[PDB]
């Protein structure tokens, strides 16, 4: 076994003890850290014995809750700067006789301790810059320090990565898809291409509605960074500052749900309303086919809302096969999303997950676990809590990789980007309006059902949700 530098000149050579590090009982074949000092966390982050790139992502995603970015940079620079040992007795004797020392211990220490640790420090810098660049975006001095450190690393052994990381940093400062097969043809119904003024729920093709919403919702899903999640910042005062992508995504979902509800209760005529609901369930069907689970729940939420859920006369006339489609989608959310979670884990991506349960799990993980563990008089960073958060952000990221093979239709995309069912009204008054509309079109028992004039001048018959294909 290799001798180490004295802990007096190199802090990362302190022996492991239960006062500075605690392991999970379960291996995997590398140890799992339950808790430790920052020093010990950083030593294991850059350990000479093994690599653990997943630890790097975990640490870089979550470290800010126990260490400042400026301090992290200081510590890994400190980790990088390893003293070499002095010649041994055998070396000494060779030198005293005018011979070249074998330097066996020095060479082994360079090869098996210094170079792996330095390389792994560089790997942290690389990951930090490529995947967590916001620390540098928000603090230019931190970036200057990083550039300086990287730019002044000497020695032929690190040279390739140092030159690379320098270039990577420069690129990141001033800052595409291949398939596999071509996307299916864009489908059109009553509204023809270019006629955005006629675009509406029943006039667009239900297939193309689902596709373009799935593209939109996928882009929104894919844009959310871990920095919008860690620290539960999307729930705090500065949420619009710290979580703008998450909140845009959630607001899209909310607006689509409200739009479905509005389309339904503003269709006073029963027969037409049945056509509207049936079209929405068809759009749900295409969402399921595309694994757009956010889109699925958008519809389900709308159908279970107070204004819509109570429309018994409408539900009555919905074909039994669509009732089953709706009920099956609803059952995904039952028992704390038990069937949703099983389905997400079994499908072939691309998909659009429902983000909501990730937020709840991250919030609760962070709220229900202490920041530190107290052991033998010492305060240790509770790292298993951070690993739990990083497992959730990691799963989020895993589903953000796969792009949809679907063609954008710019006008339909724009139509849904600009959807604004609430208009200038505040939520409560719009929401009270929807429910009053519901009461109007289907009054409570024992009030008899009124009739209402039709409002749609074009045909109500759906073109269906099976895709067509000309030569």
């Amino acid at each position: 076994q290799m001798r180490l530098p004295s802990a007096d000149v190199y802090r990362f050579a302190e022996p492991d003890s239960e006062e500075n590090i605690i392991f999970e009982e379960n291996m995997q074949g590398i140890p799992i850290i339950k808790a430790g000092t920052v020093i010990k966390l950083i030593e294991r982050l850059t350990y000479h014995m093994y690599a653990d790139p997943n630890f790097v992502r975990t640490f870089l995603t979550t470290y800010r809750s126990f260490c400042k970015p400026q301090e992290l940079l200081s510590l890994i620079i400190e980790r990088f700067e390893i003293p070499e040992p002095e010649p041994t007795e055998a070396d000494r004797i060779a030198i005293e006789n005018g011979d070249q020392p074998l330097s066996a211990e020095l060479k082994r220490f360079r090869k098996e301790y210094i170079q792996p640790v330095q390389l792994r420090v560089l790997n942290v810098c690389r990951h930090w810059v490529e995947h967590h660049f916001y620390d540098f975006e928000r603090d230019a001095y931190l970036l200057q320090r990083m550039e300086e450190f990287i730019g002044t690393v000497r020695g032929k052994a690190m040279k390739k990565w140092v030159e690379s990381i320098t270039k990577i940093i420069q690129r990141k400062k001033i800052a595409n898809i291949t398939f596999q097969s071509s996307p299916p043809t864009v489908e059109w119904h009553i509204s023809r291409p270019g006629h955005i003024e006629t675009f509406d729920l029943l006039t667009l093709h239900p297939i193309e509605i689902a596709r373009q919403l799935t593209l939109l919702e996928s882009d929104l899903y894919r844009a959310v960074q871990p920095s919008e999640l860690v620290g539960s910042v999307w729930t705090k005062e500065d949420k619009e500052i710290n979580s703008p992508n998450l909140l845009k995504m959630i607001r899209h979902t909310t607006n689509l749900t409200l739009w479905f509800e509005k389309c339904i209760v503003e269709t006073e005529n029963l027969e037409e309303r049945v056509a509207v609901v049936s079209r929405i369930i068809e759009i749900l069907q295409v969402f399921q086919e595309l694994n757009n689970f956010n889109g699925v729940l958008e519809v389900v939420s709308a159908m279970n809302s107070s204004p819509v859920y109570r429309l018994d006369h409408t539900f009555e006339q919905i074909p039994s096969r669509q009732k089953k489609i709706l009920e099956e989608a609803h059952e995904l959310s039952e028992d704390h999303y038990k069937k949703y979670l099983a389905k997400l884990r079994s499908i072939n991506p691309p998909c659009v997950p429902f983000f909501g349960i990730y937020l709840t799990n991250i919030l609760k993980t962070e709220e229900g676990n202490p920041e530190v563990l107290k052991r033998h008089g010492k305060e240790l960073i509770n790292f298993s809590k951070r690993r739990k958060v990083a497992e959730i952000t990691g799963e989020i990221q895993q589903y953000q990789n796969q792009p949809y093979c679907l063609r954008v239709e710019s006008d339909i995309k724009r139509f849904f980007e600009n959807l604004n069912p609430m208009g200038n009204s505040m939520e409560k008054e719009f929401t009270d309006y929807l429910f009053n509309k519901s009461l109007e079109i289907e009054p409570r028992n024992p009030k008899p059902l009124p009739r209402f004039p039709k409002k749609y001048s074009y045909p109500l018959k759906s073109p269906g949700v099976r895709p067509s294909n000309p030569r």
Partner: protein, 167 residues
């Protein structure tokens, strides 16, 4: 074979709401939680000598999904309406939550409790007398809880179960 109560926690985000259900379900005696595993929101308890099963839905963190409120609420037979005692806005929100619950359940008499939660050591801005008055005007119990010490947590959930049993 025992009775199972479907309990739903509602209230403003960002002010320690999730601590209530976590402290209930929690180990007790060990500060730890994995919301990811089942049994993290289900709990067998004895209330006035009758054993029952608590299923608690707390979607803390999803407050911005405001159009999902109705569907989440629909699932419950009893409700905890939670505000933070250092956040007046969360207290003023209570009325709309109650109105929304009534609408979803289609009833003027839904088992619910009002819960004032102390989530940190910041200054209180909602006096307990204000919350008492509000609760009395609604005809529902009021319980104050601490998010750190577990005080009042059992009382909040047990009281709600009594409201259900006596409905």
């Amino acid at each position: 074979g025992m009775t199972e109560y479907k309990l739903v926690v509602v209230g403003a985000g960002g002010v320690g709401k999730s601590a209530l259900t976590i402290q209930l379900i929690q180990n007790h005696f060990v500060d730890e939680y994995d919301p990811t595993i089942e049994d993290s929101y289900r709990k067998q308890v004895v209330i006035d000598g009758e054993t029952c099963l608590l299923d608690i839905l707390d979607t803390a963190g999803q407050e911005e999904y405001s159009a999902m409120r109705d569907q989440y609420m629909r699932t419950g037979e009893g409700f905890l309406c939670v505000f933070a005692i250092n956040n007046t806005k969360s207290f003023e929100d209570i009325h709309q939550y109650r109105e929304q619950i009534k609408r979803v359940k289609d009833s003027d008499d839904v088992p619910m409790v009002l819960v004032g939660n102390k989530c940190d050591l910041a200054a209180r801005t909602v006096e307990s007398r204000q919350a008492q008055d509000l609760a009395r005007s609604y005809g529902i119990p009021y319980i104050e809880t601490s998010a750190k010490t577990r005080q009042g947590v059992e009382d909040a959930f047990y009281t709600l179960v009594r409201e259900i049993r006596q409905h």
